[PDB]
Amino acid sequence: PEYQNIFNKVQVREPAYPGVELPKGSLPRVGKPIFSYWLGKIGDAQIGPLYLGGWGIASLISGFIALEVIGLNMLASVGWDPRLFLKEFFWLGLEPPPPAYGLSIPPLAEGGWWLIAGLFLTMSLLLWWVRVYKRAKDLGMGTHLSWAFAVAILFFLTLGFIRPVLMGSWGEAPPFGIFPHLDWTAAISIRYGNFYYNPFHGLSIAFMYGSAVLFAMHGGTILAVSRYGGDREIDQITDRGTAAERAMLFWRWCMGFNASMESIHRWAWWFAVFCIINSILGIILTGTVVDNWYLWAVKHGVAPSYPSELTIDNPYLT
């Protein structure tokens, strides 16, 4: 057939690019850039350099302290054996305090290490937030990447710090494992009567499906007009060429309305952020306001009603 533009057939090298000049008073960039042939088959081949200033070092100290703690407790749970660590790795975890301790600080091997790791991971993510903000603002760009990051951090803090405090127990938070955190997911659905009848859960699922749909559509459309220079979106925005025109006619003819080369990126932004906004809203109300989502859905006229034919006798009533 015709070239599909999925891999780079011919590669070219020039000396590495150090980066746009920073404002005066900045630290130098660390690292000497290297090139990857395999990364260059699909994208850009340069790796590095990297910018390490004040906020991105405090972050990376916090995060690595947290990682050391989590790893060592997982390793103590098998008796220090690395062979068993590799053998049973998906079943290990660091577990939260027993719920009877409330919001106090428990002893170290009965939930205090969980508390330490949570605190250090929190600080890591807030320092990283400041780094992302300043990096985009020192180059003179809008700070749109910090708004979305803030939303994600808020969801991490909701399930984990805010909801456990509003409930009165640290033992309501997830543990640090793979299968352990999957077990937490299932159990919190079972305890509060079926998350499928949580309406914010349904809306966030709507927006996660929509993210996949929209990004398949956009990735397809821009690869399909890259023969007319469509992959260069900044120029198509500030001087509309034939690639943008064809891209917008396609969708107009197909489904009756369209966006522009700049507006589709606002649709992307919002579809990714409403998913997490509804995530926060659905978790923050569970347990603190609603105790059984299925009974809520029945009270508000939402759940179907299968035919019965039988009678089952509740043995606690007999």
Partner 1 sequence: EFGYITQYFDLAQVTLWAFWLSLLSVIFFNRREDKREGYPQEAVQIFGKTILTEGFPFMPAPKTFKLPHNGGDVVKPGPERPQYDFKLEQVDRFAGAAYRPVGNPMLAGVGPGAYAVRANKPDLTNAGDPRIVPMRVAKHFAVVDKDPDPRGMTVIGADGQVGGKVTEIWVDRAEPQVRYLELEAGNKKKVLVPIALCVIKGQKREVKVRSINGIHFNDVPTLSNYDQITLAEEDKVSAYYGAGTLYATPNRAESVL
Partner 2 sequence: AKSFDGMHKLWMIMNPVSTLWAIFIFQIFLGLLIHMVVLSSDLNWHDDQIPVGYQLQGETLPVNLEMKAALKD
Partner 3 sequence: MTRDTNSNWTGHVADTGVTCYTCHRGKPVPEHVWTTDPGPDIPSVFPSNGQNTIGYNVAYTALPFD
Ligand X SMILES: CCCCCC/C=C\CCCCCCCCCC(=O)O[C@H](COC(=O)CCCCCCCCCCCCCCC)COP(=O)(O)OC[C@@H](O)CO
Ligand Y SMILES: CC(C)=CCC/C(C)=C\CC/C(C)=C/CC/C(C)=C\CC/C(C)=C/CC/C(C)=C/CC/C(C)=C/CC/C(C)=C/CC1=C(C)C(=O)c2ccccc2C1=O
User: Which residues contact ligand H4X by CB under 6 A?
Assistant: 67-68, 70-72, 75, 105, 115, 118-119, 122, 156-157, 159-161, 173-174, 176-178, 181
Cis geometry, peptide bond prior to residue 49 (ω within 30 degrees of 0): yes
> Known binder of ligand: residue 233?
yes
- Tell me if 189 is assigned to a ligand binding site: no
Is 306 annotated in a binding site? The answer is no
Q: How far apart (Å, rounded) are the C-alpha atoms in residues 113 and 96?
A: 8
181 is in an annotated binding site: no
* In the complex, minimum distance from the CB of residue 287 to ligand H4X, in angstroms, rounded to a whole number: 16
Nearer to ligand Y, 88 or 245 (CB): 245
* Residue 53 interacts with which of ligand X, partner 2, Mg ion, none, CB < 5 to 8 Å by class: ligand X
Instruction: Count how many Cα atoms sit within 13 Å of the Cα of residue 266 in the half-sphere of its side chain.
Output: 5
> Binding residue per annotation — 88?
no
Q: Are 271 and 214 in contact (CB under 8 A)?
A: yes
Query: Which residues sit directly before a break in the chain (C to N > 2.5 Å)?
Result: none
- Which amino acid, one-letter code, is at 12? V
Point out which span in 124-132, 141-149, 152-160, 181-189 binds ligand X (CB under 6 A). 124-132
Distance between CA atoms of residues 318 and 314, nearest Å: 7
Q: By CB under 6 A, is residue 4 in contact with ligand X?
A: yes
Residue 202 and residue 205: Cα distance in Å, rounded?
Answer: 5
Q: Which does 217 bind (CB under 5 to 8 A by kind): partner 1, ligand Y, partner 2, none?
A: ligand Y
| Binds partner 1 by CB under 8 A, chosen from 37, 86, 104, 312 | 37
Q: ∠168-110-58 over CA atoms, to 5°?
A: 80
DSSP string, 183-230: HHHHHHHHHTT-GGG-HHHHHHHHHHHHHHHHHHHHHHHHHHSGGGTT
**Using the rule CB under 6 A, which residue among 45, 74, 121, 247 binds ligand Y?**
247
Confirm or deny that 265 is annotated as ligand binding: yes
Q: Which is nearer to partner 3, 93 or 118 (CB)?
A: 93
Smallest gap from residue 93 Cβ to partner 3 (A) = 5
Distance (Å, rounded) from C-alpha 84 to C-alpha 69?
18
Q: How far is the CB of 109 from partner 2 (least distance, A)?
A: 13
Q: In this chain, which stretch among 44-52, 117-125, 173-181, 243-251 interacts with partner 3, using CB under 8 A?
A: 173-181
77 binds partner 3 (CB under 8 A): yes
User: In this structure, how many other beta carbons lie within 10 angstroms of the beta carbon of residue 254?
Assistant: 9
Binding residues for Fe(3+): 218, 233, 265
Binding residues: 196, 201, 218, 233, 265, 279
